[PDB]
Amino acid sequence: ENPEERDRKAREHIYEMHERCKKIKEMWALPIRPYGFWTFERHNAQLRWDPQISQVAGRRDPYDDLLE
Amino acid sequence: LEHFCECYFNLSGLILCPVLGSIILLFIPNSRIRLIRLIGLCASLITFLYSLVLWIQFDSSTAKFQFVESLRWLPYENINFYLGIDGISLFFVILTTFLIPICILVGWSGMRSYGKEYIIAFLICEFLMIAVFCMLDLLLFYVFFESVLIPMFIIIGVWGSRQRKIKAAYQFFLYTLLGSLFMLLAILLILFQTGTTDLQILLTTEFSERRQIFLWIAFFASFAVKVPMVPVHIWLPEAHVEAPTAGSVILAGILLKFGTYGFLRFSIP
Amino acid sequence: PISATMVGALLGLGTQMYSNALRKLPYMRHPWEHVVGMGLGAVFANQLVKWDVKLKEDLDVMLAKARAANERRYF
Amino acid sequence: RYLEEEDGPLMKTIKGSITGFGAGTIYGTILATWKDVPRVERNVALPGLIRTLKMMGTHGLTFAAIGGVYIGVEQLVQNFRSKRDFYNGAIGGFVAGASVLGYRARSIPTAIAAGATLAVTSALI
Amino acid sequence: DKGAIEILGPYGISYTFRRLAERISQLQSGFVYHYAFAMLLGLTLFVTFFCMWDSLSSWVDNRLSFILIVSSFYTK
Amino acid sequence: MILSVLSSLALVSGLMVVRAKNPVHSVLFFILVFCDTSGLLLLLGLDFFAMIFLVVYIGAIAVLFLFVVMMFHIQIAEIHEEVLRYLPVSGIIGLIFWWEMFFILDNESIPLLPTQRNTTSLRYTVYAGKVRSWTNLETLGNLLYTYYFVWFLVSSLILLVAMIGAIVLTMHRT
């Protein structure tokens, strides 16, 4: 092989690997329990469903019948 | 980074030769004993000549790794693996390629009863051992060294002379696997610092004296079993005696060298 | 070169032969089945490659959302 | 990481003996319940209870012996030698294992094996 | 080579692990009562160690815990 | 006091379930336990569940147990054993369970100590909820078949499995 080119890809590997060694270690530090996951809309199902059944017999405030 | 070499004869084809021989032999009936014998012998001889050519184009002035080529594993390219040799590994590739045809020739007379399984096992051993000697990565060095245990186990157990081959094969497998697991622990220990297993990078990172001591102990656990060093040498007499002749040749001439190669290649530098 | 179609066709042919061998039958007992296996293997390999690309695409967005949720902590 | 205590080596040894006796009583209870009763005792209740209580007492005695001698020798090593490490406690584990389990097992190889095993455990700790 | 190293090696290791596997196999006694008793014991151990280990630390230590467990192997 | 009486009856009847030498007698005591449970349910105001415990536990399940145990004609030699040697193992397991599990509610649900003062006058009455009172039955039926109908249907699948299994394991057609 050509000694000049062989010795040059050798430099690109290291320069690229010393400065490339940071990206993957950031994923390993990602929290498994995200910040405020219960805030995520998928977890607030009852907050959006229950108002739709708030007038259903069986879960009404007793005074709602007296005024309606 | 694709590190593809420019030379025509490279490492990957020398890896592929005995693999292709094994696949072809998979499908040839055991009645065609002559064809099986000739195909195995010729594949091994072509691999030997290929290694001789690799010697010819060796450059004896550089401290770098020569004929370096790369093989991608994932499209993410976080983990990418390299093969390459130097002046410490070249002659071991040559010795492996030279010894394998000798093994096929030693069992020439008994091949009618040996079958194609004998030649296939030795060709697979050849492929795995050449890979081991040609790896610029701790993890792949691990993976391909452990792989030789399976065909070596089969070689000792099936074509050994007497029933002591049972105990010999068990002990060979278990001792070698224990050492290998120790060096797997060392590999993971290294990966946690560096985030990589590429040999070239590890040659340019600085390890603390303390963690150098402990990683060296973990490497020593594998290598001293491999060498062998006392008192973990007792598997060797049993295994090297009970194995068939060609099995003993491969065990003593190549497999024993893997511990000293590991000392030269990872532990000392 | 070494395309997914060729790897898949070889794997399908190998599957039919391996299946025949396991049943102690000649390698080429029902050759039209070997053709069928080559076709199915090629199809499966190509589909697997496409699915791998799509899987990486979805994982990218999902990691992006995870990163945004994590970065919301330092606000 | 360890500053929640009041210590006292004699208290350590006494409390270790008591804890060992409790653990041995529970262990003997479990062992006695696991086993079957002899065929000549199927129709009579009292001797089964007697044998269970005897097993309880024997195992409480031996486990109290280990749990006392262990801490006692451990403290008697770190007091005269006046040092804190895993070496103190490995000696105690060895002597406890050897002495008690070889008195019960009536063999020296068992004593050595038990002492060595008890040291590697306390060494890990 | 054929003496202490064999005893503190493949010969001794094979013997002890054979006896231990022997002992563990006998635990699977075939009696449904043993299997239920084991589940009850595991449940009791769970409650005892993981919730009723608050005031126990005054009289106990972790060292003695693990020692007595290993010591149980050398019984009878 | 009344809960003391019912709990004492349940305790004795349950001990008889687990300690009677004759299994037919065990089934009969089991029936006494379900009667006492129904009494507790009546104290809680759950008359539907009180009646259903009689209909299903005593009227159907216990009848099944009684039919099977009676036709077995078990001899005491096959199931006899002395239990005096279990008193310690039951003592530790019972006590640990007793100390932990009878008092688990005490820290979360602290009892109100009854004082020498009439707290009954502090009971506040809201007549709005009393205009149209719902029975236990209609409160349950408002929910089973509409808002939680999937669980209802899965229970049906469970019963279908029971029917199929009963046939496949025991049927010998003449």
Added chain:
Amino acid sequence: MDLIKYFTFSMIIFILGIWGILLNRRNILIMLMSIELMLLAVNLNFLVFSVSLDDMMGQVFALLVLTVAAAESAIGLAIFVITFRVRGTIAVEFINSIQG
């Protein structure tokens, strides 16, 4: 004190089931009966909590658990019947051949 008294009632039923498992090593029919006792205790736990919490979820699940208890007893007694039919006896020494 109502809630602690209702809970300890169900609790004694559960402990009695546990004891019935512990005390009946030669009598697996009573072992099945002890398991039903535990299931009854859990059912009672759901009903008491429903009242205490003023919530209906405890009551729906109680009904469904009754369905499960019924199916469980049916299948269990079928398995008992076929075991007896094969062996001619219910003694525990004839159901100990699987081991190790």
Added chain:
Amino acid sequence: MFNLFLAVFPEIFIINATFILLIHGVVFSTSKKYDYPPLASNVGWLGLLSVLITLLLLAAGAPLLTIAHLFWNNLFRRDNFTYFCQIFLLLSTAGTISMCFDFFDQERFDAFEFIVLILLSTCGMLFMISAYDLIAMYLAIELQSLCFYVIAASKRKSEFSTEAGLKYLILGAFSSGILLFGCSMIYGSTGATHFDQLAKILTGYEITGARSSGIFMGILFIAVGFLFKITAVPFHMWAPDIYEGSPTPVTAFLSIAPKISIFANILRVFIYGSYGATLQQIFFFCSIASMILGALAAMAQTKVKRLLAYSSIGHVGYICIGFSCGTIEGIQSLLIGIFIYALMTMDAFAIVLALRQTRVKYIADLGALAKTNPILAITFSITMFSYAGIPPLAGFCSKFYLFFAALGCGAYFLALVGVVTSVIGCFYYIRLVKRMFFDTPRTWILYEPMDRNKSLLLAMTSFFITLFLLYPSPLFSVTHQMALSLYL
């Protein structure tokens, strides 16, 4: 209104098809005109078809399974995680069914109800995966369990099968009662059974001194039930006896699908909920106990089925190490381990079922197999080496992660235990290879060749086991996707 039920199209179809097959089987099995034909294979083929159509409906309608999520919220929760879990469950059920036809016709097991019970248990496990409330989880678990109790006792004149059933029903019912007690304690302490509500109540407090002993013991009892289900030590001893005494197709089915379903449940209950370090310690200690006991007991075994049962116990220990460490990579590794163990178990039981045609029972019965069927002996050897975790076979992933987590969570006793148990496992796995290749017995057993179904399944699983590490990207990406979807 009708479009709301698009969220349950897969389940509706499979239930209806199961009813159709029940009616078909009972109508024609009783037919004098047709001379009471055995219908186990006919119904089996139709049920395999039904499973595949269910898989098509589910996989091709991925967004539609999330339709009307508010309306369905108090009943179940479908997302990407449940999507992939259910697809894998259906694939496993299809493979297990395909492995049963030689058993049906050669043994003459004519009971078509076997297939119906398998399909109903698959329905139960589907509902298990999507369960998002303690009540729904319990009901689905019970449906699954009752189906297994019945099929474990299907050989109703066999001493072994009846013994298996009796032990299973008693121990299963006991564990279910314990789990239900835990559920009742949690409800009483929190007023909630929906997983979202439980997450909101329990998050941010764990054990903040004033810990709800009711919540803490409810979690413990539920964990005990879960550990029984995954056959974790010390709640394991039902598994070897049931696995050995049940009909071998039952044993194959029990070895795979319930693990997938219950691990989905465990992830969504614990991982998505909150008591915390206590429960990860539960699974940590049970993992260590399972690895040690599985290794030793498997080393003691002389019979194939018992060996595989103890092997599965050890491997669930390896898998639970991932749950214990409580990280995105831990969950991903648990999923990878489940997938690979399932494929390997399918391979192993395809071989076992093939060999059951000549009544294989003992390991020594494999003697001279490398002579009487060389390609079968090699295939079985690849499975064993994969079980041992020898690289580059697929089984190496679980070992690699076990040690990765041992040095990631910071646990060196765990690493030591892993090394020792891995070596013990390798010994008892290569003992089988020695029996097939090295031994020269005086009497040989000649085995009948396997059917096409098992040969094809074996051929595909054997290529996967040998070649997975050449192209492992899709599994890695899909498992990372699923691990993330649990919280986002």
